[PDB]
Amino acid sequence: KPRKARTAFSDHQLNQLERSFERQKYLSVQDRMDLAAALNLTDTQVKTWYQNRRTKWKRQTA
DNA sequence: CGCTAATTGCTC
DNA sequence: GAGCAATTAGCG
């Protein structure tokens, strides 16, 4: 059952994703597209990173 | 094993 | 169509 290769984010991409998460828990479609373009990532990579980041946030705080 | 990226299937 | 919970799975 073919799956996508696991993305290895750069330190730069991870730093900028985390900065985005400290500013906003959720992104609008426009904020997601601006962030994907700025980080040379796909819209779905950013969406999924934000979803998995909220899961971790919930576990560590809840 | 632990961290976390990707997948699935459901709610809303 | 975005979120979320449960899950699968890559890599250090």
Numbering used by the authors: 231 to 292
Excerpt from the publication:
Transcription factors (TFs) recognize specific bases within their DNA-binding motifs, with each base contributing nearly independently to total binding energy. However, the energetic contributions of particular dinucleotides can deviate strongly from the additive approximation, indicating that some TFs can specifically recognize DNA dinucleotides. Here we solved high-resolution (<1 Å) structures of MYF5 and BARHL2 bound to DNAs containing sets of dinucleotides that have different affinities to the proteins.
The extensive water network is lost because of a hydrophobic patch in the major groove, formed by the methyl groups of the two Ts. The hydrophobic contact with Thr285 is replaced by hydrophobic contact between the methyl group (CG2) of Thr278 and C7 of the first T (T7) of TT. On the other side, Asn282 is connected to O4 of T7 through one water and to O4 of the second T (T8) of TT through a water chain containing three molecules. The number of low-mobility water molecules observed at the protein–DNA interface was significantly greater for BARHL2–DNAAC than BARHL2–DNATT. Consistent with the relatively high predicted mobility of these waters, the level of electron density seen in crystal structure of the BARHL2–DNATT complex in this region (<1σ) appears similar to that of free solvent at the limit of resolution (1.85 Å), thus explaining why only few water molecules are seen in BARHL2–DNATT crystal structure at the dinucleotide recognition site. By contrast, the TT dinucleotide exposes a more hydrophobic surface to solvent molecules in the major groove, which leads to a more mobile water network at the complex interface that is entropically more favorable than that of the AC dinucleotide.
